[PDB]
Amino acid sequence: GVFLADASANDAAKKLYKYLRLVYGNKILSGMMAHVAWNHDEADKIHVLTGKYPAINCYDFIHIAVPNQGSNGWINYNDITPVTEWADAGGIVSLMWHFNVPQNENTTIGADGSGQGINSSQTTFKASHALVSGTWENKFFMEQMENVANVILKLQDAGIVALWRPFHEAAGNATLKSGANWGKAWFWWGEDGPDVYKQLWHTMFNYFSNKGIHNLIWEWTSQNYNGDSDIYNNDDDWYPGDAYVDIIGRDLYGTTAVQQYSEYSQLKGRYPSKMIALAECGVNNSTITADVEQAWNAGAKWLNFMPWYGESMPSDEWWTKVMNENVVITRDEINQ
What we know:
alpha/beta; TIM Barrel; B-1,4-endoglucanase
């Protein structure tokens, strides 16, 4: 896995990947999620609080399908300045995509984001139909994958390269051993099982490649054992394969240092050739997410961490400690 999965990855993407492999196991990159979608507002807040920016900022294509975008629309993916200005200042770019779909075949998504859903409790959209020409699902799926591809191509033209983490947490709770009704995926892209899921991943990978997109480092998000191998199988059957994945990510909320080491070490053992990343973290209902240095010293040597915004966001005290830990790379420390 020393070279990127994309055989035609461009100069700058190969350079970013080389840097990540040099960081790996020595320090951990800081990161922060957008406030919802297309900004670096939370990274900015961390800078106001600590004097330092997170090294990585993640943007979400969640609302790509909303109509009437523009400078006084609700959102505007056509303006890539929130991303390019981050890169101009030396930050690293991360991208993800909560793949919202219309709630049903008769629903027009609203300019304010209404009319969208992401799993079967919210939409009739079936994963197994997304790849079948002639279905309403396939028409929307191809139109929005094209819209996202086209934004990424504009980013590429402007010199941007990015971590790309689509179709995440695919297995959800579907690996629950008992087979109870709540043992189900929580995003539509996993609700028709692992083979359809891997088909979706392969399809996007080959489509992006066919579109000439070569600025991405691909990150597949594993559920591991969902915290308990006693009652969950792991999600190895959902892994899209070495030729389609550069980095393995794991999303953990409210987890202690030793428990993070358990998660990191298990994934590292099953994916020996891949870097393992803490792709999402944050507080949960009752507990904080472990201090980063404490987790690192417990053995959880993630490539990077990225907390979520909102109710999940770690406290100001948490961030002040973390951004001053020498093992944590901040934006001003990537290159000096």
